[PDB]
Motif scaffolding. Structure first.
Motif: not given
Length: 445
Positions: A163-177
């Protein structure tokens, strides 16, 4: 109820789960490889294990396998000293540690990665109330606190983020943390709940990450301000395919906000902690233009209030919601952690007339006095039990012989004898923890 990974293997098993540039796993692939590993993990018959892991595909398989096996994972911060690991792992009663990077630690059984439904092949069931992961807080700010996070905590954090940030099925999230911290691991959880792709990257390299952003259709990325800046300086002067940049953890200047907005970057600031399973306050690009110092608004079913404000409106930040932890596992004498179900963050904040939260100072959970760690919370527990003391806070006080010393402030309707209080404190605390300065006050500083 079915496991989230199982559900994804069934419902969209040909969607890509994780990429490290070289390999890429679909959800069907990930489920199968995790299920196979889970049988190997169950054969050790530990319901709680240590994970000594890096940001890698194999480490994500291991994480997912542990959850299918109904094992609770304790994440090891790989930056810790051997003594701190030992102490943390012993405190929550683990003896078995699974590795994806070389570890040598005496007194633990250490196993590196050599060796349809999980109802059918594992004999395991999914429960939202099970503890997913156990994380420790930092020892530099106060005591190292074991924070148990349930699948329900993680799930509530995800849908509030949706809700606050927003993502869906088409999200490609880069995770380096780091994958052992909540900003790292929460990305994996959002992914397996929503069914999107994680681009896992081993370590921060600004040049390599910019190449990824340009060339790999990265939509989401989690950063700290300092690393956002480093990316901007390599050439991040337009969003490309970025939809969301999630910032958190450090100070964000107005100057950096203005620079990022000029480059059309969709920057979001956030505030969160281990105890809330990631962010519970989020600020949009527009919110950040208006109030450069805000960490934002909370999400629909999270409840945030200030306890005993000033006339300025500053006071300790209290939070309630399904994302909040059930309470610490260790240490076992933290007694003041909840008030009427509200978690006391120990942050000084305000909520202005519009709903914007601004964080200021922190309540200091540590007094280093003469080469000794002392904990305010322990003094406050004992002091509050002394006759007539309704409330108390123990703070650091300057002392040229020792640097800092503990001083106790207390609210009392009566007239406290210092000598009686010192004697009472000394009966229940080790001598060094006992304060040497006292002040009766009408309202606590």
């Amino acid at each position: 109820l079915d496991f989230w990974l199982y559900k994804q293997a069934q419902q969209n098993g040909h969607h890509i789960a994780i990429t490290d540039g070289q390999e890429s796993y679909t959800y069907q692939n990930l489920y199968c490889e995790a299920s196979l590993l889970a049988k190997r993990l169950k054969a050790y018959q530990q319901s709680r294990v240590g994970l000594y892991i890096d940001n890698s595909i194999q480490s994500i398989i291991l994480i997912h396998a542990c959850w299918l096996a109904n094992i609770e994972i304790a994440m090891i911060n790989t930056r810790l000293t051997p003594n701190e690991m030992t102490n943390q792992m012993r405190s929550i009663d683990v003896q078995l540690i699974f590795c994806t990077l070389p570890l040598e630690l005496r007194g633990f059984q250490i196993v590196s990665l050599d060796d349809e439904s999980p109802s059918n092949i594992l004999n395991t069931s999914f429960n939202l109330d099970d503890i997913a992961s156990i994380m420790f807080t930092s020892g530099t700010t106060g005591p190292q606190k074991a924070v148990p996070q349930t699948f329900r905590n993680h799930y509530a954090s995800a849908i509030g983020c949706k809700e606050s940030l927003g993502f869906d099925r088409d999200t490609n999230w880069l995770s380096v943390l780091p994958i052992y911290h909540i900003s790292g691991l929460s990305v994996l959880l959002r992914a397996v709940i929503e069914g999107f792709t994680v681009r896992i990257v081993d370590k921060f390299n600004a040049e390599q990450i910019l190449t990824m952003i340009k060339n790999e259709r990265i939509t989401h990325i989690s950063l700290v301000p300092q690393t956002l800046n480093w990316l901007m300086q390599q050439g991040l002067h337009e969003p490309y395919n970025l939809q969301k940049i999630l910032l958190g953890g450090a100070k964000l200047s107005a100057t950096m906000i203005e620079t990022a907005l000029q480059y059309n970057l969709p920057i979001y600031n956030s505030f969160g902690m281990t105890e809330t399973c990631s962010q519970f306050l989020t600020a949009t690009p527009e919110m950040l233009h208006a109030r450069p110092d805000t960490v934002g608004m909370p999400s629909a079913n999270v409840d945030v209030k200030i306890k005993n404000p000033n006339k300025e409106g500053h006071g300790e930040l209290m939070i309630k919601g399904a994302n909040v932890m059930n309470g610490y596992l260790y240490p076992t004498d933290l007694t003041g952690t909840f008030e009427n179900g509200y978690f006391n963050t120990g942050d000084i904040a305000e909520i202005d007339h519009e709903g914007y939260v601004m964080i200021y100072d922190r309540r200091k959970d540590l007094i280093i006095s003469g080469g000794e760690n002392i904990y305010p919370y322990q003094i406050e527990t004992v002091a509050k039990q002394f006759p007539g003391i309704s409330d108390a806070v123990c703070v650091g006080h300057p002392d040229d012989t020792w640097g800092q010393v503990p001083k106790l402030y207390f609210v009392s309707e009566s007239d406290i004898s210092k000598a009686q209080l010192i004697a009472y404190l000394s009966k229940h605390l080790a001598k060094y923890k006992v304060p040497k300065h006292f002040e009766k006050v009408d309202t606590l500083p």
